[PDB]
Amino acid sequence: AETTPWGQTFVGATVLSDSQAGNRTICIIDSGYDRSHNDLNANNVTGTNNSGTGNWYQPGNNNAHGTHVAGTIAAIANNEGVVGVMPNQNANIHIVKVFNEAGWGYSSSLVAAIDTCVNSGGANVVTMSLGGSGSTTTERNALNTHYNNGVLLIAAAGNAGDSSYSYPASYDSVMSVAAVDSNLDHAAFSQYTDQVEISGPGEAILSTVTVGEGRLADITIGGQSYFSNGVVPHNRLTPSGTSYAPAPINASATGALAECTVNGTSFSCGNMANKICLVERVGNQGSSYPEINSTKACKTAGAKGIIVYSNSALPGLQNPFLVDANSDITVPSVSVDRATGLALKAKLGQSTTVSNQGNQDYEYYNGTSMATPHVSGVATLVWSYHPECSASQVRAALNATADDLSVAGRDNQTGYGMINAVAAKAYLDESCTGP
């Protein structure tokens, strides 16, 4: 079975066709591309090796970022895994690997990586799900030159949760991308600046990862699965020295579905022994990490499995950090959006199986680095319908047709709003400058 992650549907890429994407080339400057992956192997992908990062087609261990980004752009349509913005093996993809597991390992600069994308890869679009705090005139000038020469530059705004400028996103020649969740709410971690230009799906984004390094979750009732609704395995963290480290619980639990009613700030769980405990999330991640509250309420009651669903404040699908100070959550627990949680209410009392599985080939990630490929993927897709238009013209089309989010007009949190592939295409259909 193949799943279409919510982000793919929201940007409106599933309704268009990438049949002409062969006239475009998108270059991914990131941590490499796992070409051995079934959902990425058969893409029209090439790359340019660098002495400091080995093979572009071999990310290495625990260096799956670029593969996740690539999957959002072009995971192959094939009845397995997922699908990217351009899933039909048409778009040309060029890979420049600047990151090793240890960090930046490129023998040269970001400018050099972009040069490679353009000169070696023939890139029309350069997507950069990366950022640094520093800025320079030489870099600003080099990127402006590429942009004026017709290369569309897109990058992540950053996940520091403040107003700091991340570069290259914050240069005028680059589109700074913000992250929003499935309810179109601004992601708490998404940096807000006057450079933020457009938004893309960035919370709980399912995509391809280096084979065997992923993790998935599932909820089954009556022989049917809620996987396609979006089931996130709790990103559990437990104490490790002076900080916290990952401590995922990968197992399955089966039992009658029972809900722990939330009254104010108290929980009415009752006896959850031998039961799958459904509970509404109390609070939300931001200044703190409250996931443990609703989760532990269930555990303390004796729950075998736990399902936390979004509250009205942030009804979208959340993939929060489950900070477990006392390592109390030793059972499988997952997170689902509000709609799914309410639907599960009708199934109370029925046998339910909740499961978290490791060693997978896909995984949910959060980040402006996840929103970025949605934007660059769509930019490439839309541009393929009108390759005669310039990068600046396509950029304008995306901004002019984005769906306004948050406060009316452009804002620092979401820019012009959610990218809209269909509307952007219709815009260029009139002319390279719109109607």
**Binding stretches for Ca ion (CB under 5 A):** 2, 39, 76, 78, 81, 404, 406, 411
20 interacts with, out of Ca ion, Na ion, none, CB within 5 to 8 A per kind: none
Task: In angstroms, give the least distance from the CB of 275 to Na ion.
Answer: 50
195 interacts with, out of Ca ion, Na ion, none, CB within 5 to 8 A per kind: Na ion
Task: In angstroms, give the least distance from the CB of 410 to Ca ion.
Answer: 6
Q: Does 176 bind Na ion (CB under 5 A)?
A: yes
Site string for Na ion, 22-61 (x = CB under 5 A): ----------------------------------------
197 interacts with, out of Ca ion, Na ion, none, CB within 5 to 8 A per kind: Na ion
81 interacts with, out of Na ion, Ca ion, none, CB within 5 to 8 A per kind: Ca ion
The Cα 39–Cα 79 span in angstroms is: 10
Q: Which stretch binds Na ion (CB under 5 A): 191-199, 210-218, 354-362, 393-401?
A: 191-199
| Interior/surface letters 60-90, b for 16+ CB within 10 angstroms, e for the rest | beebbbbbbbbbbbbbbbeeebbbbbbbbbb
Q: At what angle do helices 65-74 and 368-385 cross, to 10 degrees?
A: 30
174 interacts with, out of Ca ion, Na ion, none, CB within 5 to 8 A per kind: Na ion
Which of 25, 127, 195, 333 touches Na ion (CB under 5 A)?
A: 195
Q: At what angle do helices 391-401 and 421-430 cross, to 10 degrees?
A: 120
Task: In angstroms, give the least distance from the CB of 153 to Na ion.
Answer: 8
The Cα 239–Cα 232 span in angstroms is: 22
Match 């893309």 to its residue by tokens: 200
Task: In angstroms, give the least distance from the CB of 8 to Na ion.
Answer: 23
Which of 152, 174, 198, 219 touches Na ion (CB under 5 A)?
A: 174
Match 């950090």 to its residue by tokens: 321
Q: Does 126 bind Na ion (CB under 5 A)?
A: no
**Nearest to Na ion of 48, 399 (CB atom):** 399
The Cα 49–Cα 351 span in angstroms is: 52
Which of 185, 197, 213, 324 touches Na ion (CB under 5 A)?
A: 197
**Nearest to Ca ion of 181, 411 (CB atom):** 411
**Residues that bind Na ion in the complex, under the rule CB under 5 A:** 174, 176, 195, 197
